[PDB]
Every structure is written in C-alpha cells, then in structure tokens.
Amino acid sequence: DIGVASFHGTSTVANDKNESATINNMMKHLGRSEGNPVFGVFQKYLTGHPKGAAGAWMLNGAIQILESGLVPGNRNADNVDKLLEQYEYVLYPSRSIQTDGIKAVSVTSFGFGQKGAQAVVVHPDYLFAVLDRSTYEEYATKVSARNKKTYRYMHNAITRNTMFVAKDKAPYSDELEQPVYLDPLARVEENKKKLVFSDKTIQSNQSY
Amino acid sequence: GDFLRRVEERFTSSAGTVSLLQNFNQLNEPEQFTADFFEKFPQAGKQLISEEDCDYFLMLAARPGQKPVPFVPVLDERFEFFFKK
Amino acid sequence: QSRLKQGSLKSFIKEKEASAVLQKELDLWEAEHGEFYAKGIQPTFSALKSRTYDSYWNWARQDVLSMYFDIIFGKLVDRETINQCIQIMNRANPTLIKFMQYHIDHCPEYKGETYKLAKRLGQQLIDNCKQVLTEDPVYKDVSRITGPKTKVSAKGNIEYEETQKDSVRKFEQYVYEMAQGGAMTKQPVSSTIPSQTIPFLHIQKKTKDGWEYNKKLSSLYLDGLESAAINGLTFKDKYVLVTGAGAGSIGAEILQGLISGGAKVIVTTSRFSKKVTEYYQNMYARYGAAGSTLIVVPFNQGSKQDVDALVQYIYDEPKKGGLGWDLDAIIPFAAIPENGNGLDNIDSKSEFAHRIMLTNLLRLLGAVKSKKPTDTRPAQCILPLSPNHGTFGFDGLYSESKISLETLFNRWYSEDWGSKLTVCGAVIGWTRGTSANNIIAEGIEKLGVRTFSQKEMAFNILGLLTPEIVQLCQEEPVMADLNGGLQFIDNLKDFTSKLRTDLLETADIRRAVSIESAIEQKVVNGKVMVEPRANMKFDFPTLKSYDEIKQIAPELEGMLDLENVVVVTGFAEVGPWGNSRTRWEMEAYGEFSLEGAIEMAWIMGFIKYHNGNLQGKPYSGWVDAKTQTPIDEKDIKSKYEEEILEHSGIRLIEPELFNGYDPKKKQMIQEIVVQHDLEPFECSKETAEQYKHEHGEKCEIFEIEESGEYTVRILKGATLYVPKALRFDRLVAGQIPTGWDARTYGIPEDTISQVDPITLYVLVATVEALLSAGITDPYEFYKYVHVSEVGNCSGSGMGGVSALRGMFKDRYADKPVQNDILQESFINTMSAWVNMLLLSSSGPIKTPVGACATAVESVDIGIETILSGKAKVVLVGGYDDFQEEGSYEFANMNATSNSIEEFKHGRTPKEMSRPTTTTRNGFMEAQGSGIQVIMTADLALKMGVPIHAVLAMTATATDKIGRSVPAPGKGILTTAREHHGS
Amino acid sequence: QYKHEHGEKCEIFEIEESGEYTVRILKGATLYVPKALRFDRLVAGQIPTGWDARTYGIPEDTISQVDPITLYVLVATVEALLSAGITDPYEFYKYVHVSEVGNCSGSGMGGVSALRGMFKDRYADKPVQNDILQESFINTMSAWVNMLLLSSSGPIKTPVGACATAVESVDIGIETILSGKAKVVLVGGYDDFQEEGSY
C-alpha cells in the first residue's frame, strides 16, 4: 500500500544511487510483491534543493499527492540511469499520472553528517474509519464551517495584504500570565472580539 | 443581475461560457432563474462570498444614478449615507 | 630614460590597420556570400551537448501505468490504445511482465465495469506480451489511414481536415490499394498488382539509359510493405543517422518507426533547445523499444565542420567520447524551406539551402565512407529525391539539389564507395503536413492519383529500410518512386494553380456575398460571454461519506488511540514556485491554472487588489503594480505568464534578491604589502587612531590644526586589501520568485528590517500552514489546548545565513550592521520569532539541525513530542536561505552542479536539476521554507481542522564509521527491521 | 581578477620578460586598509592553555580536518562513555541494536571556526579547506562522533537552543528513548569561543 516514495532526489550521483538502493532493499526485505514498485517523486527537479526545507516540501507534496491521487512525474528525467534498473521495486515516472488513490507515501531525506530520515504518511480515510458515525458527522460539519472561515480569511488577507497579522499582545496579560500558565485547564475565551484569557476561566472548578 | 453575472464569473472554471442571464428581462421571475443559476454552480451555494465580490457588492450598493438599495450592507463610516438616504 | 612616448600609439595604429585588413577580408567574403549563408555556417554540433535516451525499461512501466489509469478513469479498444500496446510489447521484458501481472491480478473488479474493462484488457495485453517474450521489437503502425478533405463553408471559410478513408482503414489495406494503383497509373500483394498498371509506390529499375518502372522489384517492395503492415518491422541492430526529423515532419515519423522497431538512431536538430529535448525525450518514452537508443545532437548540416564532427562523434569509441557506432542507415532529410526564390532571386539563402541539401549531404556520405575501413557493413543512404525538378514555381536551388542527388546512382558504380554506402533514392510524393497544399490535396486526389500523410510516407520509407530492400540496395542502387501517381499528371504546376485559384475564388466570393448580405440585412433591420475570474479555494481534503469511508477501510472502529495518532492538519510552502498551491500546480501539471496565475502574480507583486476610485470610475479588482491600470483575470495570464515562469523556479541567480550578489563577479580581497607608500587621506580622530593601532610603525597619523581631523599616511611595508573578483562556477539557483515580498503577506517593515529573510519565509509559511489547518486565529489553539501543549519543532540546517554573513563579513568591513545580528543568526530564532509574533505558546520548542534532512527530523521530533504528552499541536518543518558563501562552499565540495559545465552540455536552468538521471552532476541549491501543523487525531477531530494525512511513521538514523560527512548511507534502512529466522 | 573587480579603475599589463602581470590601481579605485579597535571584552572562560586533542589521542588528521568544537565533543563523548564504563563503544551493540544508540546532543551556534573560515578567510582568499561548510554545521559534531566512535544507526537529533540547548538535548533524548526509537543516547551541548561570537 506504499504507492509513492518521495525521494530526496537531489540530482547527485551518490545520493540518487544510494537512496534508490536503500528504498529498494527496504521494500524487498519488507516482502513487497514483485512487480509492485513504488512510484518515485523527485520534486527537487522542479523546486531545487533547500537544505532545511527539502523534507518539508517533499512532505507537503506527499500530502497533496495523497489528497489528489496524482503522482507528479520527474519532468527532468531525460534518461534514467541504467544502474537504477538494478532496483526493481522503484519506478521513475517522467510525467504526472492521475491514480485512483494513493494509500501511503514514504518521504525519505538524507542530510550531510550521516543523517538519513524517513517519514511514512497515510491517507486520512484510514483515520476516519476508527471513529463512529456521529463523531464523523460532527467532524465533517466542523471542517465545513472552518473551510468557510478559512476561505474568507484567505481572500480578505490576500487582497488587503494582511496574510500575516502580528500578535501585539499575548492571550494572557502580564498580570494573569502566571495563573494562565499555572492552570493546565486554562483556555482562552472570546472578549472584545479577541481570544484572551480571563481571571474567571483560570483555576476554575467548571473547567475541572 | 450584475451580482449574478459576478457569481457566474467567480465560479466558471476559467472558461468563457454562455451566461445564463443573457438579458435582465428574464429575471422578472427570479426564484426559478436563481435556482437554475445555482444548479449550474452548486459550489456557489456552499462558498461564502469572496471579498472581491463583497467589495463589488458594496460598490454596487453605492453605485450612483441608481435607486438606493432597501438594506444596509455594511456599517462602515458611510453608515448614515446608507441609513438615511 | 630611453623610453618612447608614442610607441604604444604606434602599435595601436598598426593594429588598427591590421583590423581594417581583416575587416575588409571578411567584408569581401560576406559580400560574396550574404548574411544568411554567413550566419548559417556557425558550429552548432558539440559532443558534450549530445543527449542519450536508453531507459526503455523505465518508460515501459511508465506508459503501462498511464494507460492503466486512463482506462480505469474512462479516458480510454481504440487505435491509439493498440499503438501504445504495440510499444509496450516492443519494450516487453520479464520485469515488465511481472509488473503488469501484479497490477492486473490485484485489480478489484467490483469497483465498476470500468475496472472490469481495465482488468480484461490487461489480461489480453499480458498474454500478448508473454507471446512477444524473447522475440524482436517490431515497428507496427496501426494509425487509421487518413485522407485529405476540404470543406468551404457557406460563409466562405475554408476548413481542411484529415478524415479516415472509407475504403482504406489499416496499413494493410493501404498497401493493397498501393498495389492496385489507379486508373491514372496505367497470396501476397505481388499477385494483386493489375497487369499493365503501375502501383503508386514502386521501384524503378535502370535500363540501358534511364530509370523505368520494374515489376519484380516493385512486387518485392510491396510484399515487404505488406509484411511490415501485418507482422510489423524490426530495426534491431540498425544504427541510423537521421536529419531533418523535427516535430511535424516526415523525419520525425521515420524516427518514431525506427525507435519502435528497435533501431539505435542519432537524430539531428538544427534548433537544439529544452523544448526539442523534451519532444525527443517523450518520443523515446513512447516509442523507444527494447534495444533502441536515441541520440539527440545539435547539428548544422550547413557546416562541413558540423558534418565532420558529427560523423567523428558517431564513429569514435566511447572511450574517446564518441558513440562507437557504425552506421547502418543514413536519412538526410534536413532542409531549409525556400519559397519565392526564382532564377533572379537566387540569394544567400538559396545557396546555403543548396549546400545543406546537396553539398554537405555528399560530405556526410563521404565522411562515413572515410570512417569505415570495413567493406561488409554498408550504410543505406535514403536520399530524399523529388519528382518535381523545377516544374513547381519559385523554390531557389531546391530542385537543383534534388536532381543533383540523382548522380549518386551512377557514382555508386563509377567510384569506390559502393561497399561502404548504398544508394536508396526515395522519390517522395505529395505529403500532407501534420498546409497551403493541404487544401488542394483533395482536388489532386480526386482524379485517381493520391496524396500521402506524414505517417504514410514514413511507413513507405521505413519499408524501404526492410531487410529485402537493404540487400537490394547492397547489390544494386534502389530508386523508390513513392510518388502517389503524380508523375502521370500533365502540367502539374498549372493544374495545382488551377485547383488553388478555383478554391480561393469560391471561398472569397462566398465570404464577400455573406458579408454584403449581412450588411444589407443590417441596413433593412436597423450573446454576452461570462468573463472568468479566479475561484481560489484552499481545497481542504474532500471529506467523503461515512459509509464510503468504512467501505474503504476495514472494521477499525475504536481500536487506535487517537490521542497517540498524529495527523498533518495544515501545511504550506515558501519556495521557487510560490506556495504549496502554485508549486503543486507546476509540479502535477507543469502549467499554472487561472487561480495559479493570479496567485503567482499576487505573490510576485505584478498585481495588487484595488478598491475604490480608479480614474474616477469605481473599480474593485486586480490592477497592475507598476502602472496601477486594471487587469482582467484572463489578461493576468496573458500578460504575466512569461514573467512568472521566467522569474520563478530554478533560474540564473538574480543579484537583486541576494544583496547584489553576482556569481559572475564574486567579490574577494587579497592581502598586498605596500611597496611604495600611498598619499595621505583624511578621516576622523577615532578612524586615524584605529589605523595607527593596526599598522603600528607602518602608518602615520597627523592632526590638521585647521579642521581638527586626522590625515593618515600608509607607509611602506604596510598591508592593505585590494578587492578582486572571480567568475563563480555556479550561476543558477532555486530562488523564491522575484518580487516576492513579506509586505505582500503583511509582515510589518519593522519585522522585515530587524529580522532576516529566512525568518520572513518561516513566518509566511507558518501563517499559511496554520490557515491551511483552518486556524484563522493562532490563539484558537488555546480554546482547546493549554498554552504548554503548542510546540514548534521546525528547524533549519544552517539557518540565519544572512545574519552570519553580516556578523562575519560586514562587521569585518565596518558596514552598518544591527547590534543583534547574532540573535537573528541562530537557527532557533526563526521558531522564536514565530512564537513571539503568532503563537505565544509555552509548549515544547525544539530546533533540529539536519543539513538536508532536517525537516523530516523535525517531523520525527514533533511526533515524539506529541506522543510523549509534551504537546498536542506542533509546528514541524524546515527552512534555509540561499546566500553567496553557502553557495560557494557547496561548490567547493562539488556538491552543487557546475552551471558552466551544464551550459557546455547544452542544459538550461529549467532542466538543471535532474534527479535519477544518467548525466546528473550535482544538486541544485534552492531557498525557502516549509511548515506543517501536525496534531493528535483526537484534537484534530475535536477542533474540526482538515486532517490532511496521518504520520504513521517517522524516524532518523546515521550510517556508520566513515571519513565522509556529506556521503549518504544506508542508515535509514533502520526503519525496516524484522527477524525472519504472526 | 583585479581587472574584473575594478573595471576601468585599474590597469593590468603583461611583462614580456617574465610573463607575469603588473597591476596599477588607478584613481577612484576602492581598497580596504586594515584598522584595529580596542574591544571591551578581554576575559573569557577558555579551555586550559595546553589542552590538546593529541593528549587524548585524536589523530592529527582529525585535528586538521575537523574543528576545535568537534574535538571538544569527541573528547567529551569518549570521557562520558568511559564514565559509563563503556571501554569499547561497540559494547553497546552486545546488548542493543545499532538502530537504538542515538546522539541527541547539539550546539547553539556550533562550528563557529568553520563559519569564520568560510565567511572571512574565504573572503580574504586565505587557505581554507574545501569542505569547511560541512564542519560549520551544528550536526556535524554528532556526525563525526558517530563516524569515529559509535557507528550507530540510531536516532540522530541536533537541537539548537543558544544557551538552553543541552537541557533540550536531554529532553529530546528522553523522548527518543521513551518512544522506543533508542535505548542509549548521547545528550548534551557544546560551543566554542571566537572573535565574532564574542563581538
């Protein structure tokens, strides 16, 4: 069910060889069916290589791959290395292909200093089946409302150039900062159209 | 009708198509026409007004040489102008 | 002194007269030949610019999956499907067989009749590929035989369309009608040819004088065509050199057929570019069969240097930089179109085109012959002969070149290159481009003669590359009249002009009558389209029905601790293609939609939203930035697409985005000891005292009694630093789109000035990720969570590079630098500022460092933080910035790709990053930030945020003992751990 | 290079006798004269004078290639393992898989000597190793610790916290152990004193 492998894919001779090798070896040791390669996403072909944000961009791409079902192809894959035919459990598409659903994506990053890292991301549909119907309907209604709020805020701020709204003040005053902290059940409430902490909602028997 | 044209433009998928409201006279029975319009665009019934369309609505309400609308759309600085005119 | 004041002026005037001599020599050559012939002979070919395609093993699976999902979604049983099946069969190998077997034996049929169709077609194709196992790859053209047809609408509009012939559907029936011939041209297809009738495609035998139609050779050729049509045609072990095979030409279809049959083809392109490279790439990906190899080379057939260099490259061994190939066929179809050039208009263009078509062609053949010492492997030269030598109008030297190519038939005998080259002169007939002649194609066809498609002509020539015609050419030069009976038309030019003028005199009169009838109606009698605009949404994950989700997943209800299940609730980017949305559009589609284009223009500051009065008229919408004029949403794309793509993604490093950093002018300073002391300069008291402190006795300071300021004399033996510059090898980076500003997202200028651009990217990405999670207000976390459970586990690998450069270099230079630059240099100060500006959480705050693999490590630390109970919500991710010194050090260790070597190889910035590619030579450095808001599943459900996915696993690992820091290793194999000796 | 930088504000000429070039820095050219200032901070908590990595046995190849913060890390890691009684660092693997020996230590600004190299010595065109950036990273200390001593493939975390990074390293190590990712982990922190950081 691991359909896509978001490769580090740095267009480096050692990196794309070693990474394909480890992905193939792990897929083979995990008893993956023969003739079932993981599709290779190589997002760095388009986005370049940010050292810090490499895995982050690849995870965001894997998120979007899970949502949409599309596996982007490495459009700079002029000619796949012949040495990578070695790896039967890896496929290297060069054109984006729309799939009927991707269950999971394996994001793999390799950093300088002998620092490999792997993340496995699974589709939300397998989370939504571990909860009863009524919880699902409540969740879906809440997300519908929130998507409406988000649509508004995004359009408000994209035109008015107020995407980032710096917080001038913390939700707690300097006077209430320490009760607010000192109560683990402290939670902000709406006051003056802002979510702030109040003396009444701190160390309250109602919260407990 | 201008608001309906704006909704058409908002929810057409980057494709210039035939306007449902080709002329204003067919809006004389607006319930059925609005129904057909928002069946063409079902997502407009679930999407809140994008604020570009909100500002367009506000300047439509404030369009001069037009009968002022029978409602207050906003409570900004020009609230007296909407309330008393 | 014994010096000459004017010696170097003498040398200058001497060199000026020498330059004049060279200039008048060049001007004489130029007036002799002309500017077209002049700038047409430049060297285009370069051995390092050659592009190899041989990964048919990969492309087979790629095309298999493409077709599989197309049928699964009903986008595709049909001839194009059968053609793709032929290609997949041509690439069939045991691994591919196992691949299709898995994907079909595990195709669920219950999902729909469409899935049942995908399955059964897959079983049929698996059987076909199993049968094809171990046998050769065959070029089998299965496209429907299309014919010309022109319709003049009653409004006078001429419309030409290629429409399937009623009596001919397959290439088998095409060959049958070729054998049958026509009224004008008067078990195998040998027995089909009518007596005293010349088939349209035939081979002419040379009598004791000229060339005449021959029955036996024509029957052999048509039988070869029939065999190719029914069984296909293998070109394995055929090394071809094809020129003039660009898109929309006969040569391109020839290349498609050769590479389908398994040939190893060197394709020439006179216009080498990324577009042409991608065209040949996907042509190999479609048609490149088992054993095929496509070598795309830049090449000018107008230059003998290019001809010799290409032939040398083909025949040189791989150790010497060549291909080590011995050509089996040559197809020099490269030509220059010359129209309106009569005898009096024979010009530089005509002479140059003649050179390409004849002289450099003969030179190419001669170079191949000179390179071959073997006499047992001739190269088959497919000469593009024409049936019309001057009969048509103003074509320059085209007819001269075409008729001159006919001398090779006699030169095959008269000279000693017979054993090295064989002559196959294909008299190519009327071929339909796929335009001025296409409208009269139907008229010329109606009289019995016929007109070919590019695919049909390519099929004819590829059949001329049959083994039977190959040996026929070896023993005897072949003249293949592929003219479709046009030779039997008296006064072809006059008939053609009559047809075209009749068609034009019909269409134009119909149009004029329609126009004037419309005007008459308007005199007697005295729909509005919708204007699209951006429908930008965020598209939270589509929440499906509970019944259908429980159908997806088994009875898993009430099993997982959702508090211990972590989920991505939000995410965002700041990268070379804007944010996550625009980057994803460019990734999955390669082009921006309307929403993508408007978003890119907005982030890049091409457009800004205007509300209120604009030139008096009330306007509410996007306006230009530099001109403030209205821009309709369609004109957003139409006006900003080219600039968005030019200034987004991987591109040349722009010094305006990196404080004037020009890699071509990389500034350095060199220590020099002053040999002759400098003249005084004036500075302040403290500056002079600092100079005396540094230089000791190697400088002097003196107070000016008039002004009170000090003057500094840098004595002999002092050291100073003279700036110097070097051309830096790396010129290209994955930079954030030009015009990207933090003000566009709304970060105050106070924050922009005090805080560094990496942190600005982090702030924008964190805001976008929270509002991707639907968190309009970041304090809304605290309505469900304690302030001590909102963490920030993101971190950079080297973040704060701009501040590091400040403190380490600008401070050394005494430039204005903020007192707290070190504060901004820390890798954790980005997360600090994120908390101070947005969250105000007291939750766990981790800042990983991982160089390239820090964002996944941030995710891992976030999972650990949430699962330990220290947090419920955490911001994970990673960020870095591109700067001069980081780029220079990545170049020192040969980690980044050398852009100069890439340009030597002909690569552009848009194709510089080549993951998992044969010729990849280092990574492409980029900049930006990427943030994800990850949460517990229970909390995500409680707050109703969009659960984008589930972080089922995250882990980090190290490799082993070594002495190579940047070397990757198999350490992260520690995520697949099991004993096999449940 | 001088002509490239200074444009028309300098002249270069080949000496026909020797073949080398002579550079004349014309009027209006910019040059950088060294100057010195008395810095307010004269006192630091420095490692004792005569402290050498050779005294602990780190080869001169490592001392030359790798930066002094990392030498301190290596000495401290060896001393900590043998404080734990781990004479041989591979003795972890007699009880634990190579995937469960982590290193969650990290610096706040580690690699400052390499940062100074790349940012200033490189600008001055002084001899600097081609791989100084790899030594400038904050995780390269743990990388070298693993490459020289442990050979583990366990979880590898490199916290940054400026002053409060060693306690954060301990916190990440507790999390790593309690999540099952590791059984043993090296937690701590390190920094070096240098001119620019002090300033």
Place this chain on the structure above:
Amino acid sequence: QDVDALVQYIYDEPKKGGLGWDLDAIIPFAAIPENGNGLDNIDSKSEFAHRIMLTNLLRLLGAVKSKKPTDTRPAQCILPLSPNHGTFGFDGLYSESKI
C-alpha cells in the same frame, strides 16, 4: 560580385562606363577541372567548381533577367549539359552541376 559586376557592365550604357548592350545569347562554358575527387574527396575545390558551374551560372542568368525590362529580346542560354552524370569516375561535383 564578379557576375553582378560583369552583367552591370554589359547592360550599362557607354556614358556610365558600360557597353550599352542587350545580350542575345549566353554561353557559360567556364568550368574548373576536378579529377580524382570522389564522394569522400569532395573538397573546397569541388564546392568552388560546383559554384562556378551551377550557382553563379544561375546568378548570371538571373542578373541578366533582372537587367532586362524588355520582354521581346530574350537571351539564349546555351547550357553545357553532359550525357554522363556520375557514370564516369572521380569528378567531384561536376556531374551534380551538369544535372
């Protein structure tokens, strides 16, 4: 340039330095002998000779045509065709020019 200059000189009137003649016949028999030049020996000499025999011949004809505004006095171009187009041996581009 020689072709154009000679044609200009022929068709220019005596006052302007030419001959003031309208050509009734053209006999371009100028050729360069090229022997031992096969397909592999096609060289600068072969291309130059081909230019003389074909390309500048066509340019001479075209220049005469451009100079003639009259349509009632054609020039008879006696083209030196050959019966042997490549049948004989190593002649460079001679057969190509003739055909």
Place this chain on the structure above:
Amino acid sequence: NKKLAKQQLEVLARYLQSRLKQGSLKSFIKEKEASAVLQKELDLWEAEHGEFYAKGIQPTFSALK
C-alpha cells in the same frame, strides 16, 4: 636608484599634466583582441570552406580592364 628617481619624476609630470602613460597601450591591446576576434571569424569561415574556395572568390573583373 637614479632610474627609479627619474621614473617617479616622469609619472609625476604626467599626473599633473593630466596625461595617461598606458592609454595607447590599452588601445593597442583592445585593438589586438579585436584583431583576434576578426581572425577567428575568418578562421572559422576558412576552415568551413577551404583555401581553394577562399582564394577562388577574389574580384577579378574590372570595367577598366
């Protein structure tokens, strides 16, 4: 010693006359690289066509001849 005295006096007089010692040498090297540019253009053409085709295209015709 004296030669250096004399050089420095010479450059000084140039300074105050507002004269440039190396200006015409600058012009010479500029013209030399221009000549190299023209020579490489001519060399490319020549290697593209050959010496025979090169020296065969000279102007022979002259109306006065």
Place this chain on the structure above:
Amino acid sequence: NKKLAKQQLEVLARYL
C-alpha cells in the same frame, strides 16, 4: 595645481 605638482616633486626627492 602647481602647488600640488610641487608637493609631489618634493616628496619624490625625499623618497629617493
């Protein structure tokens, strides 16, 4: 102008 000429001459004689 001339004074600067002369200052340069002057320092020159000093130098050598």
